[model samples]
Target: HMSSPRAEKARLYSAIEQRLEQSLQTMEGVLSARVHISYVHLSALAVYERGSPLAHQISDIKRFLKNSFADVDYDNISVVLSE
Candidate 1:
């Protein structure tokens, strides 16, 4: 547990990232996933292993992220599938 608002918020971001990453791991062709949700500028990055064609996964992630964090614009959310 934390007292400061920033500490709480920072921990919240890490917790959510861990949860999202774990969830993405179950997706087809996804060996693992990593999420970096920035406190600065309210941006986010969903990066994961690209086992194969990623068009569907990329679109789905971006769309899903668009629905979250009202302060974060869709433009700032990036879904990067890398080797």
Candidate 2:
């Protein structure tokens, strides 16, 4: 689980979620992307281009995380892509 200073957690989560939702909003071939907030964690699931190397587009998702949380740590992130 990722941990941030309790004082900054809310803002940090909001920033990251907003960036991710915005990114998925304009993406072509993206069927859908959903973000969920649990009692102590945040998660997102997206279905997009399949049958192709995600290497090219993975950066977009990664960038979303980085650009959104530039001031926070991203090492605890977890991602899973599939058909």
Candidate 3:
């Protein structure tokens, strides 16, 4: 039976979240990450307490995510880091 499009999108979003989560975990200074996807943008929250140039890691995160979804959009892929 045909179902709500949102349901299908949610399922797909979870799959993408898992993939992005794993990739981020292995990165240095990335204590943890939580990803959420939406109709037009994908945003993430990451926790890190390591001593490093914060902006360097920020650029790395942005590039990784933007390239990951390069097929669609990069400017819309945003990130926020936390302590």
Which of the numbered candidates is closest to the native, going by highest lDDT? 3
User: Following a full C-alpha superposition, what root-mean-square deviation does model 3 have from the true structure?
Assistant: 2.1
Q: Which regions of candidate 3 are displaced past 4 Å?
A: 1-3
Q: Write the per-residue lDDT of candidate 3 for residues 3-63, one digit (tens) a residue.
A: 6887877888789888988888888778899988887788888997657777777778878
- Comparing 1 with 2 on TM-score, the higher-scoring candidate is 1
lDDT tens per residue, model 1, 1-83: 47899798888888877776776676666676677887633333445556655777787776665554455666777776765
How accurate locally, in lDDT, is each candidate?
0.66, 0.60, 0.80
**lDDT of model 1 at position 36:** 83
Off by over 4 Å in 1: 40-53, 67-71
Looking at model 1, the pairs that clash are: none
For TM-score, the strongest prediction is: 3
Give per-model TM-scores: 0.68, 0.52, 0.81
Better of 1 and 3 by lDDT: 3
Rate residue 21 of model 2 by lDDT.
66
